[PDB]
Chains A and B, each alone.
Chain A
Amino acid sequence: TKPCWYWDKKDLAHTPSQLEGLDPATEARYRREGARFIFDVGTRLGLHYDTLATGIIYFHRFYMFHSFKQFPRYVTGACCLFLAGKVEETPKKCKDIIKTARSLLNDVQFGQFGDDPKEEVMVLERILLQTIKFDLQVEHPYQFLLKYAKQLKGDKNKIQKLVQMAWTFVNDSLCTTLSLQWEPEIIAVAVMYLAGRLCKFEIQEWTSKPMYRRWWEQFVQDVPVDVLEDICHQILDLYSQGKQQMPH
């Protein structure tokens, strides 16, 4: 019926890019750069947050089936965003994505787009669609962050602080392979869990079951804390590796 789009962390060591000789760190750097390229380009074009994420998910899934050494990352990204626009009904013309890409990319980087940027991108759409197996509908952590936050009742300001911090964590997670490991519902919970831990908020008190210390179980059944701790760890690693710190 519908395809399985989630792999285990251990499986990411056997991605095509890795097996052609890319070291793990480099594939991750390419994944962030490609995702952030998609984010930056779409933001300049005014795109909805769902459109940006859908492109990034297409992108991340793509390089589970193909290698970075044979398919250039900035070209793929532009293609993903181009298709994501059509899927999420926020369409853009390919020439406008190329233009925006030129502004944000170096000459070396834009070299990947070659002599005819639009052509390289429009030609890749055929492969992209077959790679993602025409599973075009994608759900993102954002809708669950809001759906779950709406059922919290309490200090308006503490909950809004929780949501915004968690929302930032969602945006940051798009740079990682978490999109390929855990359903979005879990991600939304994990970022709520992280924002709470950092703000010293006890979310159970805002739920309809205030003495149910594992507040997530009423939103997402069957999620071990281990999963939530792993996701949290992976998110904070991005902050510790970079120069940026937790938003608070």
Chain B
Amino acid sequence: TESDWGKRCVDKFDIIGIIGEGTYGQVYKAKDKDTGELVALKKVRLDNEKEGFPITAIREIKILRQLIHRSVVNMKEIVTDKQDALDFKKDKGAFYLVFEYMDHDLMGLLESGLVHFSEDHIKSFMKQLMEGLEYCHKKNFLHRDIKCSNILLNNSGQIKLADFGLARLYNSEESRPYTNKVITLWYRPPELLLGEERYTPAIDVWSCGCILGELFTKKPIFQANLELAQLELISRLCGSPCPAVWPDVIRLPYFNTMKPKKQYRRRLREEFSFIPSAALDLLDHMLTLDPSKRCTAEQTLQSDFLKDVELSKMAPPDLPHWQDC
């Protein structure tokens, strides 16, 4: 049946190319020999035999087989290399996680500088992304690595979230010790920069806000190399973590340690004056320092910006293929 994973062989796919270098193996683009479908195989190498199947891949398998949403990448099946016959100990073949193939990635579209996003594209873009995050958040799952590289876009305008390798379940009633350095520095929330463990699902909202502004500016908002320089940039824009705006900031491990140059005042609305009034509110609320005052996924979908966005009228991003020609 369709559910008997791990047995079908990778012979069933024509490998087309190597799309990317993944955490646990490289992702290859492939065409299904039977259907003609384009898929992306993520190779899983358990031949290392350090501690067996990678836990990053176990999370992506465990979580994605549970999550079904238009904006969440789908794992279609898991296939294997030609396995050794009757000698399971000798076999060191690898497993491949089959996914739907996505044409582009948000970073690749932006790094080329080719795409220009209109307000109405950013509406269609963020509505899907935040609706997807809402699905995951309602299921008590945290993505924990929301970056441009992980947002996949099709020419049609459909958006899907993708690398769940660092995703784990969150129970609000029970505070659990977690890994503090989990998000990419550019998209890392302030609490994780100040050493916060037992973090809220609002860490993902911060990342999505960084993207929201990045779609209007066409350049990432907080670009730094070191954790302190990042807090400085965030502070120049959002205001320095201070007891008034973030009452429990005094409880974070590094609050006294990582002071910014000044106790800055928030200028987010000033430096982003060019953003539409509907969006600037969304950005202001998504990039709020205090995780308890940072909006939820649902609150972004019930915003003047994204609420009345009709999702049937998906708008393709401005893709200038003929420009270079």
Extra A-B contacts (6), CB below 8 Å, given A87-B58, A135-B3: A83-B53, A91-B51, A123-B89, A125-B52, A133-B5, A134-B5
Residue of A nearest to B169 (CB): A89
Task: Say yes or no for B49: interface residue by CB 8 A criterion.
Answer: yes
Residues of A within 8 A of B89 (CB): 119, 123
| A23 nearest CB across to chain B (Å) | 27
| A125 nearest CB across to chain B (Å) | 5
CB-CB contacts of B1-12 with A at 8 A, as 1s and 0s? 111111100000
- 15 pairs across A/B with beta carbons < 8 Å? A1-B3, A2-B3, A2-B65, A3-B3, A82-B52, A87-B62, A94-B52, A122-B52, A125-B46, A126-B46, A129-B95, A133-B4, A135-B3, A136-B58, A136-B65
Give Cα A125–Cα B6 distance, bound, in whole angstroms.
12
Give Cα A124–Cα B52 distance, bound, in whole angstroms.
10
Give Cα A125–Cα B89 distance, bound, in whole angstroms.
10
Give Cα A207–Cα B95 distance, bound, in whole angstroms.
49
Task: Say yes or no for A153: interface residue by CB 8 A criterion.
Answer: no
* Residues in chain B within 8 A of chain A (CB atoms): 1-7, 46, 49, 51-53, 55, 58, 61-62, 65-66, 78, 80, 88-89, 91, 95, 168-169
- For chain A, give the interface size range: 20 to 34
| B167 nearest CB across to chain A (Å) | 11
- The reply to whether A135 and B6 form a contact with Cβ atoms under 8 Å apart is no
- The reply to whether B51 and A126 form a contact with Cβ atoms under 8 Å apart is no
A123-B88, A126-B88, A136-B61 known; A89+B168 contact, CB < 8 A: yes
| A6 nearest CB across to chain B (Å) | 14
Give Cα A1–Cα B6 distance, bound, in whole angstroms.
14
Residues of B within 8 A of A89 (CB): 168-169
- The reply to whether B65 and A125 form a contact with Cβ atoms under 8 Å apart is no
Task: Say yes or no for A244: interface residue by CB 8 A criterion.
Answer: no
Give Cα A136–Cα B97 distance, bound, in whole angstroms.
14
* Residues in chain A within 8 A of chain B (CB atoms): 1-4, 82-83, 86-87, 89, 91, 93-94, 119, 122-127, 129-130, 133-137
Residue of B nearest to A134 (CB): B5
| B64 nearest CB across to chain A (Å) | 10
Residues of A within 8 A of B52 (CB): 82-83, 86, 94, 122, 125
Which one of A3, A124, A134 has the greatest number of beta carbons of chain B within 10 Å?
A134
Give Cα A186–Cα B46 distance, bound, in whole angstroms.
37
Give Cα A3–Cα B169 distance, bound, in whole angstroms.
23
Residues of A within 8 A of B5 (CB): 133-135
